[PDB]
Symmetry: C4
Subunit: 105 residues, 4 copies
Amino acid sequence: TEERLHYQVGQRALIQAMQISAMPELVEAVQKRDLARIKALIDPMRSFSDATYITVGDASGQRLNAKSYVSVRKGSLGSSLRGKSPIQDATGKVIGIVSVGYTIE
Amino acid sequence: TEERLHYQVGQRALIQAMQISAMPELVEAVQKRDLARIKALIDPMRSFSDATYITVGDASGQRLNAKSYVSVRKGSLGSSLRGKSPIQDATGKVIGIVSVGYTIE
Amino acid sequence: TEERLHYQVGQRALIQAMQISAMPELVEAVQKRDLARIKALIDPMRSFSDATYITVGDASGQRLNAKSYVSVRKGSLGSSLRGKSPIQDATGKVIGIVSVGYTIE
Amino acid sequence: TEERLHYQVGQRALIQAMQISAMPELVEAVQKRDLARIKALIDPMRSFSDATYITVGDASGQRLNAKSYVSVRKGSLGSSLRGKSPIQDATGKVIGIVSVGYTIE
């Protein structure tokens, strides 16, 4: 019952994902391959949010579908709830992907 | 249903707007046209909050009605929920305007 | 109805007050009159929380009843909701007072 | 009734504990006895969260059961609600312990 509150975390990951992948500073950085700017635009967020991890991705999936969702992977030391939202340009084309991760022990 | 929870974000934007536009440090900076102080009093808030963007405005609307509200603009890559609250002096005169933005993909 | 949600803010101020006035680093600083340490232990919290203001006080009320509560002052540009909790030593003696402020336009 | 909302704080401590003890940067630091990295990976969190205190521990309990829970100690100046979650390796072996503390006056 208390653990069933995955949506407690799941919804946090979702919104957070939508917001982080929507930031113009990140949108700019992702386009210009400014891994430096990206690094300075996420590190703070880590300690800020109670998110186990955060990840910025490229259109191909490289390690710097118009729809946002929540991923749930179960196995070993609980399960990981990771919200995911795409990074769009002014035309909507998927230029990247944000994946904020969470954990429920 | 899960998306219908715009008030989830909308209420965050509202309160945040009321608070940010109420800060004395910002009130001081907005009056003295201290764009420098303003810049150092908002940048942190960006990474802090899950707000897509934040904006400080002047009485005229320049880019540094006694009532606060939420704005909703729909079109292209979801919709943007932006809470808005005026910046007042000790007399209540509208000296500025804060507009915290959010996004729902 | 939406505005009636003062407890939304009021409860934030309350908890925040209890926590900030409970921190050992602040407890230490308040005792040793380390206004410097106090200054470095509150400034971050300002931008962090959506609190209009935050205040540390002395047992007398100086500007650096075993019970916590919420204060509500109405007039001019909305009302100010300020949670208040005392700073205790290891014996419970009131050595200070924390007053986190909020605003509802 | 308002005070009975310990789960308000208790649940915050729980999740926060699960997340902080799950961070790879901390997992790495705890294994390599990198008290320096740990120090730079927790200090921010202190001011960030409304947590009275935060603590990282070793498998033995040193001061740097596969299950997470909430601790409640009552006495003198209210009670302390401290969420607790273990630090695991890629095999699940308990390598540490995180204990985020809270207070209810």
